[PDB]
Write a protein that binds this ligand. Structure first.
Ligand code: CLA
Ligand code: CLA
Ligand code: CLA
Ligand code: CLA
Ligand code: CLA
Ligand code: CLA
Ligand code: CLA
Ligand code: CLA
Ligand code: CLA
Ligand SMILES: CC1=C(C#C/C(C)=C/C=C/C(C)=C/C=C/C=C(C)/C=C/C=C(C)/C=C/[C@@]23O[C@]2(C)C[C@@H](O)CC3(C)C)C(C)(C)C[C@H](O)C1
Lengths: 81, 161, 165, 149
């Protein structure tokens, strides 16, 4: 998949992501970043995390932030063409 | 007018001649950075001038003296800080690609030319549409940067007037 | 050009050969994922939901045997079946079947050619006997879609009281 | 007004005309419905204790407390999400602003009649937006009822 120029070929995104149009990936990335940041802030920043404050939803949201970064990179790659 | 010619003591513009594998910024990057700094400095001058002697926006508390303003801003109005940061991030992200290309000479976008003309101005014909007013903007921005530095320096030592 | 939503153009990858085709891909999901995977997911969800609706109704009306009879309403069945171990057994067996289905579907999407939602399960040979199994396949997909919506409803309705209808 | 081309700002530059026109049409339709939803509730009230004497100035908050607003938000949001590619594509070949189908059975085939009807819709919708702005502002500022004064 070695690529030159200024934008990698869509095949780098994998079989599924490579078919998604750029605006869809952009909106998905914004939603993911918002949810992840909100979850990370609600627990351990806005509220101290304790033994009995472990919300699975917030853990999933926090994990969603790297997904947000990946989706924003993929959105740019799809946008260039 | 410093001779109406490029004023580059220490020659920071010419270092693009040495390729350096792109380590040294190309003139376009420096130009865009200067215009950004000038615009920020002028808006900050407005902000300093009014906030230092001002009633302040109607809202929660909002009693500040321009040096402790940001912590109060973040504490009293978290949502406001959130949307400020988000909006600035979106604006910087929309551009930045062109800025990234502007580190070299591959910008493809005229330095400092963003899609912001709320009032259409195609009257100018000399070079870039009203190139003279572009010079005016850069000049008053340089002065505004001088002013921000002056207020910040007067902070510690009462440097001047 | 779509039979369901005429505003949108006919979605790509939905040729109409697939049973239950009404050209409904408003968000263009089909373009994103390999179509056979989505078809298998739909058929599996539909079968599971048909079974779930039938189980909900039967449990609300009739009950199997002691211990199982005490729990009554299906709302308080996951807990009880967890307690006396039924959930663990059905989890184990469904997990075995799904694990084999993993390699089964991996063969698919790689050129094996397995029809989506296809197994050897036809002991009565209704479709095998009938050359026109298209009617049966369409019926399965449609009743499964109805079951998906109906189970979603029933669950979200009984979770808010509403007794039994 | 009549045969009048305003665009004093000149926003066609750095913009997609089809996008802005679709936005105008949607705004217009929703504003017309807003005007009639202003007018009717006072005279006619939907059956139910919840829908009784709520008032139009305070409708949003009260119904937000109750179920209705969330329900209508969900359904309108669903429809809006379904209508994403139509807006995103901005394709001239794709259907021009406004739904190509769903038009009532009595839609004149003549292209000239199509233009006339579309213009009538646009004008009465612009009146809708202005009328509602006035209605709500005068509703909050003054008393209650259809006069809003
Ligand atoms: C400067 C940082 C940087 C940048 C710009 C890139 C850029 C790229 N990476 Mg790399 N990468 C980096 C750091 C970086 N990487 C680091 C630190 C790691 C971890 C060690 C990886 C691990 C990695 C893998 C494993 C893969 C890439 C791939 C890619 C390409 C597409 C991105 C993609 O498909 O994500 C899209 C991601 C999503 C849509 C969801 C991600 C969900 C989370 C992250 C899990 C693109 C050329 C892909 C590629 O081209 O390989 C063929 C790929 O498969 N990257
Ligand atoms: C800190 C922000 C900043 C930045 C990035 C620049 C960047 C630049 N300036 Mg500006 N400038 C600044 C602040 C800045 N200036 C201020 C505060 C003043 C007032 C003293 C000036 C006054 C000034 C003049 C009078 C000229 C420049 C010129 C230049 C260019 C070449 C010199 C250089 O590399 O500067 C780093 C470059 C685009 C020259 C130019 O146009 O480029 C050849 C030029 O003639 N600048
Ligand atoms: C009463 C509280 C309140 C409300 C309802 C809004 C509402 C709004 N703000 Mg926010 N804002 C507020 C207080 C508020 N603002 C405060 C106190 C500040 C100062 C920190 C800001 C700073 C701010 C910025 C910097 C921006 C908004 C913008 C917006 C609008 C875009 C949509 C959005 O959610 O953002 C929206 C109408 C955006 C806007 O004006 O776009 C049209 C935008 O970029 N707001
Ligand atoms: C290394 C991380 C990384 C990478 C590779 C990218 C890459 C990209 N971003 Mg993203 N972004 C990042 C971090 C990153 N971003 C962060 C931290 C933010 C703020 C939350 C954003 C916010 C953002 C927005 C809002 C947008 C992009 C967009 C883009 C794309 C084009 C614009 C661009 O690259 O310049 C933009 C330049 C920046 C954002 C400056 C980031 C500078 C970082 C902080 C420096 C850190 C790197 C450092 C050298 C690593 C050292 C590690 C070492 C110590 C171990 C491109 C795919 C655009 C896009 O997707 O359009 C389709 C877009 O609109 N980015
Ligand atoms: C998990 C359930 C599920 C799954 C995987 C599918 C999957 C599929 N459906 Mg089915 N469908 C479902 C539920 C489901 N549907 C329900 C509840 C209804 C209403 C009763 C329908 C009605 C329906 C019609 C009428 C048609 C399809 C079609 C399709 C195919 C293309 C659309 C697509 O990729 O959707 C992605 C699907 C999702 C369910 C996930 C998105 C959910 C977000 C988060 C909301 C695909 C095989 C089309 C086709 O080609 O027929 C085979 C077609 O014409 N479906
Ligand atoms: C999605 C499919 C599904 C799932 C997960 C369950 C799960 C369960 N069922 Mg239900 N059930 C189903 C389909 C399903 N059933 C169908 C299709 C029928 C009709 C034949 C029934 C008829 C049925 C009866 C009559 C009873 C259960 C009972 C139970 C529980 C113990 C397992 C047992 O004895 O079953 C076998 C458990 C919560 C028992 C129970 O404790 O009720 C909660 C019980 O008495 N189920
Ligand atoms: C009640 C509606 C309904 C209908 C019309 C069908 C019809 C069909 N199913 Mg489906 N199926 C259903 C419910 C239904 N099934 C449910 C509730 C389950 C879960 C237990 C399954 C699980 C299932 C499997 C696992 C398989 C079928 C298969 C088949 C086909 C052959 C079996 C047969 O004799 O047909 C009646 C046929 C198209 C088989 C198939 O398509 O391959 C021949 C196949 O492999 N079905
Ligand atoms: C075929 C499916 C089906 C049917 C016939 C109904 C029928 C009805 N619903 Mg239910 N509903 C459904 C699916 C369905 N719903 C789904 C899929 C959901 C989840 C999105 C809900 C969630 C739902 C809620 C939360 C409520 C209803 C209510 C109602 C009643 C109005 C009516 C009896 C209301 C009710 O309980 O009235 C008895 C009510 O409050 N619906
Ligand atoms: C102080 C309260 C108040 C407020 C907020 C408004 C505000 C408004 N009026 Mg109202 N109006 C007022 C007093 C007020 N008016 C008074 C005292 C009268 C005389 C009885 C009117 C008679 C009036 C008429 C006859 C119309 C308006 C209309 C309008 C709207 C059009 C604005 C425009 O184009 O020019 C700024 C605007 C929102 C117009 C409207 O609703 O849509 C165009 C309209 O047709 N106004
Ligand atoms: C089977 C089949 C087909 C079909 C079909 C059918 C019939 C589809 C039916 C869809 C259906 C029936 C969808 C119901 C939705 C209910 C919703 C969204 C509820 C929201 C509920 C909300 C927002 C709840 C909020 C509240 O709870 C809150 C928070 C507190 C309480 O005060 C109560 C309220 C309510 C206020 C097709 C289409 C022909 C094609 C296919 O081929 C074959």
């Amino acid at each position: 998949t070695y690529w030159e120029g200024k934008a990698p070929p869509s095949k780098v995104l994998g079989p599924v992501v490579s078919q998604i149009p750029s605006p869809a990936l952009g909106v998905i990335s914004l939603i993911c970043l918002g949810v992840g940041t909100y979850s990370v802030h609600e627990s351990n920043i806005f509220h101290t995390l304790t033994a009995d404050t472990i919300n699975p939803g917030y853990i999933i949201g926090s994990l969603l932030t790297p997904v947000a970064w990946g989706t924003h990179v993929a959105s740019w790659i799809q946008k260039q063409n | 007018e410093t001779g109406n010619e490029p004023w580059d003591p220490m020659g920071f513009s010419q270092m693009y001649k040495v390729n350096s594998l792109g380590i040294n910024p190309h003139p376009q990057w420096l130009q865009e950075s200067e215009i950004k700094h000038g615009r920020t400095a002028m808006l900050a001058f407005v902000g300093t001038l009014v906030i230092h002697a001002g009633i302040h926006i109607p809202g929660l508390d909002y009693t500040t003296d321009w040096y402790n303003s940001f912590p109060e801003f973040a504490a009293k109005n978290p949502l406001g800080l959130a949307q400020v940061m988000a909006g600035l991030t979106i604006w910087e992200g929309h551009y930045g690609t062109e800025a990234g290309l502007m580190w070299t000479g591959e910008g493809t976008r005229n330095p400092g030319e963003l899609g912001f003309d709320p009032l259409n101005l195609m009257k100018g014909k000399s070079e870039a549409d009203v190139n003279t007013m572009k010079l005016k903007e850069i000049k008053n921005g340089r002065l505004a940067m001088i002013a921000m530095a002056g207020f910040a320096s007067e902070h510690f030592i009462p440097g001047s007037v | 050009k779509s039979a369901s939503i005429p505003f949108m153009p006919k979605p790509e990858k939905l040729d109409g050969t697939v049973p239950g085709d009404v050209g409904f891909d408003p968000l263009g999901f089909s373009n994103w994922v390999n179509l056979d995977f989505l078809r298998e997911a739909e058929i599996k969800h539909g079968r599971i939901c048909m079974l779930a609706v039938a189980g909900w109704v039967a449990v609300d009306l009739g009950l199997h045997l002691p211990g199982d009879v005490h729990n009554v309403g299906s709302l308080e069945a996951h807990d009880t079946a967890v307690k006396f171990g039924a959930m663990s057994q059905i989890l184990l067996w469904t997990s075995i079947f799904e694990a084999i289905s993993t390699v089964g579907v991996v063969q698919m999407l790689n050129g094996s050619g397995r029809q989506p939602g296809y197994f050897g399960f036809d002991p009565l040979n209704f479709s095998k006997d009938a050359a026109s199994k298209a009617k049966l396949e369409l019926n399965e997909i449609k009743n499964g879609r109805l079951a998906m919506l109906a189970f979603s409803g029933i669950v979200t309705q009984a979770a808010l009281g509403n007794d039994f209808p | 007004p009549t045969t009048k081309n305003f665009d004093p700002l000149g926003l066609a530059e750095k913009g997609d005309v089809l996008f802005y026109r679709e936005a105008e049409l949607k705004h217009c339709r929703l504003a017309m419905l807003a005007v009639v939803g202003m007018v009717v509730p006072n005279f006619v009230r939907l059956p139910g204790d919840i829908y009784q004497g709520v008032s139009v100035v305070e409708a949003h908050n009260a119904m937000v407390e109750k179920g209705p607003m969330v329900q209508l938000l969900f359904w309108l949001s669903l429809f809006e999400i379904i209508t994403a590619p139509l807006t995103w594509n901005m394709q001239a070949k794709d259907r021009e602003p406004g739904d190509f189908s769903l038009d009532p059975l009595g839609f004149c085939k003549d292209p000239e009649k199509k233009k006339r009807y579309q213009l009538s819709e646009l004008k009465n919708g612009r009146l809708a937006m202005l009328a509602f702005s006035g209605m709500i502002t005068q509703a909050v500022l003054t008393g209650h009822g259809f006069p809003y004064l």
